[PDB]
Amino acid sequence: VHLSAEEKEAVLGLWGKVNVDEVGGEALGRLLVVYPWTQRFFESFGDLSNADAVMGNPKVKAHGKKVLQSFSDGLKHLDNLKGTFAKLSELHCDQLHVDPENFRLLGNVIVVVLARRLGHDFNPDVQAAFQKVVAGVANALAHKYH
């Protein structure tokens, strides 16, 4: 996408104060409890019938950390998010068969967790800067499709 020259700092700045590790485990876990139908892609993760079990399950954390790691090792490469998620979308389309609607759902989920985290410092203007980024990933990942 096209963030400005000020929005570039709003994001880059607070990505440095968010423990992407925990966030990654909270976004993925928060998704699965909120959007139940996605548990179908993680059935080899064990049990996910109760909110607690899911937000405890060590697998979700280990993977969450992976989700947010690429989110970050993708940040800064903004103007070409299409070249950063290539194989990564191939994998999603051909291998996983995920529907891109779900990428907009996750970007939204992560975006709320962050709020729970930086609290008061996650002012409206920062939300609007992340809002465009998460759309950029969300649409980059939906690239190699049909």
């Binding site: 876990g29 928060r30 409890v33 909120v34 909110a51 899911v54 937000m55 939204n108 975006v111 709320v112 709020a115 729970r116 985290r117 930086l118 609290g119 008061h120 996650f122 409206p124 203007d125 939300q127 609007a128 809002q131």
Partner: protein, 141 residues
Amino acid sequence: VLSAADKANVKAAWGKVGGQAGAHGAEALERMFLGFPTTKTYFPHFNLSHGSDQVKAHGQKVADALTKAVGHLDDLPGALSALSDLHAHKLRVDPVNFKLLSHCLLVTLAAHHPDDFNPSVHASLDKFLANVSTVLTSKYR
């Protein structure tokens, strides 16, 4: 659908919000106008700035519709007739804008009360706002 757990999760979460309801109904709107400009057209008459009598006057109102719903979860349709005909007839408020206003209200509640907002209250509050929305998106005809 709002089940008993969902009903009691909402009430027990909204009850906590208390008097801030107004400041949080407005913040959300304000977050919406910024995060999604395409919604700013529905209001060419407000002063759409970081708070001007309008956004908080409006927020204050949005905060009350929800409190009404939150107090009538069992039967929203009746207790939401008006607004539904104000958005699905008079104003023709495009359906997908309720999806971007809910989000912001979730990012607003979550930034201010990060300790009641557990995964269940979240899941539960994503269904209130969903079934309130659907209700306000019936009248269409």
